[PDB]
């Protein structure tokens, strides 16, 4: 009873110390701001490798996802009589079911698992402790511009993932199956999408962008400075982000 329970508490304290260090490091980077003209060349540098470098994975997979949902949606509407209504299941599925859920998993591969690499490699070659030593805080130079590079670029990349896969019905329905463009676009006009499907999708993509950035900027900072520890933290960044996007999806869909 007691010999197997004493080792259970050893992993229960280290979980609270790991999750407690992610809140203490973030609270030190969310303090009273300096002059914003200094971080203006530092913001466009950290927005290039996160926003622009994760643009090809969003757009190319956007036309591939939207054509599958248009093709598979035509199978379940053949048994029904709503074959002309391809405005649903190509747009409404990419707004609440897919969209911010599936593209956040693809954001954790190109810009999520590479964000913990460029901050984890600096812990091994002692670039963080050398930059700290001279005159500057390390938590406000390599983490704070990288925190705003994920909470802003991912809601701006989610609408690109929506607006690319939403004209797959112009390819699958129109000029392939023969669905009328007036019977496809106007079926999407009459659907009530202003509050439940437009701004509720935008709130869901904002809080998803904070959870991916908080884990990606912590696994590279809290790591053993060696080649095996960076690659171990790079693997655990995708697992902790996939269980946080899908984990906070059942809770967030109850407030529809």
């Amino acid at each position: 009873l007691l010999n197997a329970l004493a080792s259970l508490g050893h992993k229960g304290i280290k979980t609270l110390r790991t999750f407690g260090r992610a809140g203490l490091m973030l609270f030190n980077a969310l303090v009273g701001k300096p002059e914003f003209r200094k971080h203006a060349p530092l913001l466009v540098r950290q927005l290039y490798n996160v926003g622009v470098l994760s643009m090809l994975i969003i757009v190319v997979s956007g036309v591939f996802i939207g054509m599958v949902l248009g093709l598979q949606g035509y199978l379940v509407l053949t048994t029904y009589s709503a074959e002309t209504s391809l405005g649903m299941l190509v747009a409404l599925s990419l707004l609440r079911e897919l969209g911010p859920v599936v593209a956040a998993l693809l954001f954790a591969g190109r810009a999520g698992s590479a964000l913990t690499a460029e901050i984890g490699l600096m812990r091994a070659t002692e670039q963080l402790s050398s930059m700290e030593m001279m005159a500057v805080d390390p938590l406000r130079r390599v983490i704070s511009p990288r925190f705003w590079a994920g909470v802003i670029s991912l809601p701006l990349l989610t609408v690109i993932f929506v607006a690319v896969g939403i004209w797959g019905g112009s390819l699958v329905g129109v000029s392939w199956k023969g669905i009328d463009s007036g019977f496809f676009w106007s079926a999407m006009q009459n659907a009530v999408d202003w509050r439940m499907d437009l701004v509720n999708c935008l709130i869901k993509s904002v809080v998803f962008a904070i959870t991916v950035t908080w884990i990606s900027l912590f696994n590279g900072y809290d790591a053993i400075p060696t080649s095996a520890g960076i690659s171990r933290a790079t693997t655990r960044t995708v697992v902790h982000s996939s269980l946080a996007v899908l984990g906070l999806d059942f809770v967030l869909t109850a407030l529809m």
């Binding site: 979980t15 609270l16 790991t18 407690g20 260090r21 203490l24 809770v251 109850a254």
Partner: protein, 131 residues
């Protein structure tokens, strides 16, 4: 201190997140009918078209074999006379059925209905019209 400082900040961040999780998951009567039709649990009861509450359960009397249902009415409208009537009407033309309280010209907690009408039956609508 650092070892004893990262424990209290970890149990306070999880307690604030579980408190944010609990906020993220957010008088009865009786009526004895002859036929209920297609009413189910949590079915709306209305008067004049506007809803005032819902029903709780739909049970059966073990002796007289008549369907007796329980409803609920909020405290905003209390002055209802005891000569009211109950009509079985559906929403629209073929939608889900509701209960229309046809009030007449004191109802406390635990009273029964008086003028109960039977539900619509499609088998007599083609029988009385033919024969």
């Amino acid at each position: 201190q650092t070892k004893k400082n990262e424990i209290w900040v970890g149990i306070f961040l999880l307690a604030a997140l579980l408190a944010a999780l609990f906020v993220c998951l957010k008088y009865t009567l009786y009526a004895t009918f002859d036929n209920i039709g297609g009413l189910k649990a949590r079915s709306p009861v209305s008067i004049g078209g506007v809803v005032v509450g819902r029903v709780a359960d739909i049970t059966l009397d073990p002796k007289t074999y008549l369907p007796r249902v329980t409803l609920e009415i909020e405290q905003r409208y209390n002055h209802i006379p005891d000569t009211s009537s109950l009509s079985i009407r559906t929403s629209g033309l073929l939608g889900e059925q509701y209960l229309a309280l046809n009030v007449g010209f004191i109802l406390k907690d635990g009273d029964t209905i008086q003028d109960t009408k039977s539900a619509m039956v499609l088998e007599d609508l083609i029988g009385q019209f033919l024969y």
